[PDB]
Structure 1
Amino acid sequence: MIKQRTLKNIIRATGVGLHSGEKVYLTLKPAPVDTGIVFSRTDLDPVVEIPARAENVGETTMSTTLVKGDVKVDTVEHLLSAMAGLGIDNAYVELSASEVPIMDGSAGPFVFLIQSAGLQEQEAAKKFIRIKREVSVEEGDKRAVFVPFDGFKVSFEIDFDHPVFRGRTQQASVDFSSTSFVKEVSRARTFGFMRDIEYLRSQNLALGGSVENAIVVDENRVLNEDGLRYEDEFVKHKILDAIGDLYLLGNSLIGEFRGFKSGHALNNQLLRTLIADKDAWEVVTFEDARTAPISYMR
């Protein structure tokens, strides 16, 4: 059978919050079967735990934020993307502050931490959510869709008209049958438009942001000296973001996500909308791994 997995060891890193600029301690820990991913604010007294589930998502304007009452964990998407890509079912994530460290702006440092901690197979069947019927949400010209697919695929299109984006592909469709999340998606850095970053900074926001953790573009050029890690790094990051947001379903997906200029808000709306309609999905397991359309071989 395809088994659930967790980490073999506890592992740690430090960084700064993108929004807050606040130095933060991060800890990843193994967790028992059927735990899912659980975030814990260890700085608070008492310690506050927030399961990484769609129903716990609060604000989604800049990043995906988990909330429990007045307590938040901000910017969970890049870490969750790594958890999803490596097929980690169960883990505890401890934080000393209200935001996951931005690290290098991608999911790479988290893939690094997870792989370094080691992967532990557990004695329980891994559960998958299979899309049975196409479900969509939109807001204006933005659209997010789940489509049935015998495997796992993420497609995305962005549509920027700024000169800096002219001629760029602005589209990608990744079938993970033959694409490596680690090698071809995970290291895609977040990006920001200079005008927007200036506005945030003017309000004392985005304090942790720098060219060392984000691709910065003005109307016309990429400001980063070294260019891009992937030729299509911008759309690859949108795909990364979607994979992280999608993992709030609590299980790996058998199906396709299609995004069109979509963001965390639409992503979460899509999740809640899917979850609510029981005719559009089912939970499946695989007693024989070679019968599965998906593989988390390592």
Structure 2
Amino acid sequence: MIKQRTLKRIVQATGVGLHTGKKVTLTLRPAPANTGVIYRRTDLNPPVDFPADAKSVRDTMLCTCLVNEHDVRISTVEHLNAALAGLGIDNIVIEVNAPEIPIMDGSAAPFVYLLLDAGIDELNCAKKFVRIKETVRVEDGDKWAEFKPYNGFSLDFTIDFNHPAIDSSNQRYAMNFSADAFMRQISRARTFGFMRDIEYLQSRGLCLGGSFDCAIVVDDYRVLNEDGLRFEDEFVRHKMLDAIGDLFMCGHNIIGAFTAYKSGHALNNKLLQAVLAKQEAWEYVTFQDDAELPLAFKAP
């Protein structure tokens, strides 16, 4: 039987929050079967839980956030969420003593190492996958995202960049998901932003944790970071990282074919909710036989 996974041990790390510019302490904790992914703010007292749920997502100006019944938020969850998906973590409690997850280097890679530190513990309970049964498509102008039936997990992402620093040769990325493929091809791709916009935000007391150490920054013409890009197509790779984090907001790995054009957080979430809302368009599947498990979802 393919089993659910959690952490072996409690681990913690520290890093600046993109919004506040303050030091945030991140604590990752093991959790029992079926409890899922729970984000928790411990700056608030009493602390507040935010179960990762498609319906609870909001696409904020910076990154994304989860909200509770009272519109209290926890922000910047998507990069860590992508790492959870990558390593197949099903149940976990994620605590921060702040309103946001630390931005780290702008990618998911630092969370990969943190999760490795915590170890993977298999629980005696079947891991549930969301298998796509019908083609489901959502749109927003010329933008669209869709899921199609497919025995595995593929992502086909096209971005509609018009910036001098992004060549047409790097407008699209497509991959067969797997823990190894996520870790090596995707996890190190950093988020990015436009310097003038960031300047404005900081002039308004926002995005205070922003720095060259946590993002690719371009002006009108070029990448400003001294060392340049980690990949020639780092921008689109990060947008796929973001797609993986968005889709994992349901707390389950998906068996299907993901394809999107000019998609973002809002549209990715719109697709996720559209699929889950349509009873006929999907079903939970488990694998009592480990052999039946598709290639993409094998352990690292």
Coarse TM-score class (shorter-chain normalised): over 0.9
Output aligned runs, 1:13-162, within 5 Å. Answer: 13-68=13-68, 69-162=70-163
Q: Could you say which residue in structure 1 is the equivalent of 2:297? A: 295
Stretches of structure 2 that go unaligned for 5 or more consecutive residues are none
Residue 11 (structure 1) aligned with residue 16 (structure 2): no
TM-score by length of 2: 0.95
Establish whether residue 232 from structure 1 lines up as the match of residue 242 from structure 2.
Answer: no
- Cα distance in 1 between the residues matched to 2:58 and 2:31: 25
**Structure 1 residue ranges without an equivalent (≥5):** none
Paired position in structure 1 for 2:219: 218
The code of the aligned residue for 1:52 comes to A
d(CA) in 2 for partners of 1:237, 1:143: 18
* 2:89 match: secondary structure: coil
SS at match of 1:275: helix
State the Cα distance separating 1:217 from its structure 2 match.
1.1
Shift of 1:197: 1.8
Cα 1:16–1:221, aligned 2, differ >3 Å: closer, same or farther?
same
Letter of the structure 2 residue corresponding to residue 231 of structure 1: E
In structure 2, how many angstroms separate the alpha carbons of the residues matched to 1:52 and 1:72? 12
Give the Cα separation in 2 of the matches to 1:281 and 1:23: 41
Distance 1:59 1:78 in 2: 14
Q: CA deviation at 1:189?
A: 0.4
CA contact (8 A) 1:135 1:145 kept: yes
Counterpart of 1:211, as a letter, is F
| Deviation at residue 179 of structure 1 after TM alignment | 6.0
* 1:245 corresponds to: 246
Name the CA distance, whole Å, in 2 between partners of 1:208 and 1:84: 26
SS in 2 for 1:165: coil
Would the aligned equivalents of 1:164 and 1:218 in 2 still touch at CA under 8 Å?
A: no
**More displaced stretch, 44-53 vs 96-105:** 44-53
SS at match of 1:180: helix
- Matched residue type, 1:21: G
State the alpha-carbon separation in 2 of the partners of residues 202 and 273 from structure 1. Answer: 38
Query: Partners of 1:178 and 1:200 in 2: how far apart?
Result: 35
- 1:200 Cα deviation (Å)? 2.0
Query: What is the percent sequence identity of the aligned residues?
Result: 58
CA shift for structure 1 position 108: 0.4
Which range moved further: 189-198 or 96-105? 189-198
AA partner of residue 222 (structure 1):
V
Alpha-carbon distance between aligned partners in 2 of 1:185 and 1:21, rounded to the nearest angstrom: 26
Contact 1:42/1:95 (<8 A) preserved = yes
RMSD: 1.5
Distance 1:165 1:40, change over 3 A: same
For residue 26 of structure 1, report the CA deviation from its aligned partner.
Answer: 0.4
Would the alpha carbon gap of residues 161 and 88 (structure 1) be closer, same or farther in structure 2, given more than 3 Å must change?
same
Q: Compute the displacement of 1:178 (Å).
A: 9.5
Q: Which residue of 2 aligns with 1:180?
A: 181
